[PDB]
Write a protein that binds this ligand. Structure first.
Ligand code: M8F
Ligand code: FE
Length: 329
């Protein structure tokens, strides 16, 4: 009974080049999608997503229970007090199906000034043994920078869309300090599938992850070709079609704050599907002290009655809030 969400495919390739009129024509498409359902597929993005999926599969399918405890975040292993964000998020057979691996900026090394300062939301990544997962760390770090590049080009499009210069958001999205994360999520096939890992929405839809707005500026997501996402619109929840050749893009609640909800963070959820699949989000986060002054593109003077919020404050509060709402993943 559910209708299909309008999720246009936008060729973002001009955002990598110097043809300004072409970039404006992409910016208009990003504006139309952001003001309608809030989602689009970025195509011609240049990233080898089949190899991303193959390397991710090799990792998820070969990592062992011992390795998962050794990489686990603090929620699963009290010995790893410094790992709030980065590391392994374990499944609980019989109870919780999903499991994942999160990593942050590869530049957050032991000598990074924010690591030295023990500033919240900055952590040094943890990695499996190289001999057990040859090439994985290097692949994953290079992927961070490939999707960082895509994200910077998308942020030039969002800036132009909002009537700003193209570096409006990108000047706060920097390799040396971005709080952006990759999450490599495995949604397993299980027979029988644990009922405790299946939630039910108020409308009866079986879910794996409840309604939410993202904690990000924008979210840049690769998924397998198994339909599962829905977006809430004025006409109710609608199905987002899968496309394992594109990146699904949406805004998160920092973009809604900065634009006075002109570009809403769309509410969306994940249906339960008993299928072996991948969900590989990149959360485009700024630096800890990044503050963009809020504005309102719908007002002639561009003024908004919102207070500036630093990205670090936003991110640390939003990540806790999302766990309290929808559970520890
Ligand atoms: C379509 S919702 C995005 C994809 C994925 N969901 C998620 O990734 C959920 C909701 S956006 N996000 C989260 O749980 C936030 C993870 C933050 C990360 N540990 C970090 O530290 O930066 C899924 O369930 O498939
Ligand atoms: Fe989300």
């Amino acid at each position: 009974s559910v209708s299909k969400a309008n999720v246009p495919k936008i060729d973002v390739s001009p955002l990598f080049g110097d043809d300004q009129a072409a970039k404006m024509r992409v910016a208009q498409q990003i504006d139309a999608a952001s003001r309608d359902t809030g989602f689009f597929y970025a195509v011609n993005h240049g990233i080898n997503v089949q190899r991303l999926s193959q390397k991710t599969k090799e990792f998820h399918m070969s990592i062992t229970p011992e390795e998962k405890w050794d990489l686990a975040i603090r929620a699963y292993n009290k010995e790893h007090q410094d790992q709030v964000r980065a590391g392994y998020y374990l499944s609980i057979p019989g109870k919780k199906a999903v499991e994942s691996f999160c990593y942050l900026n590869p530049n957050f090394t032991p000598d990074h000034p924010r690591i030295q300062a023990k500033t919240p939301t900055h952590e040094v990544n943890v990695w499996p043994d190289e001999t057990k997962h040859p090439g994985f760390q290097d692949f994953a770090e290079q992927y961070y920078w490939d999707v960082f590049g895509l994200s910077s080009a998308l942020l030039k499009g969002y800036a132009l869309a909002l009537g700003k210069e193209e570096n409006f958001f990108a000047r706060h999205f920097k390799p040396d300090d971005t709080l952006a994360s990759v999450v490599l999520i495995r949604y397993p096939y299980l027979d029988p599938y644990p009922e405790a890992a299946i939630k039910t929405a108020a409308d009866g839809t079986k879910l794996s992850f409840e309604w939410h707005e993202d904690v990000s500026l924008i979210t840049v997501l690769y998924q397998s070709n198994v339909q599962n996402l829905q977006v809430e619109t004025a006409a109710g929840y609608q199905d987002i079609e899968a496309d394992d050749t594109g990146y699904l893009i949406n805004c998160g609640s920092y973009m809604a704050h900065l634009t006075n909800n002109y570009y809403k963070a769309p509410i969306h959820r994940v249906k339960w599907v008993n299928a072996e699949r991948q969900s590989l989000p990149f959360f485009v986060n700024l630096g800890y002290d990044s503050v963009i002054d809020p504005f309102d593109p719908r007002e002639p003077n561009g003024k908004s009655d919102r207070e500036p919020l630093s990205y670090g404050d936003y991110l640390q509060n939003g990540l806790v809030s999302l766990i309290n709402k929808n559970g520890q993943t």
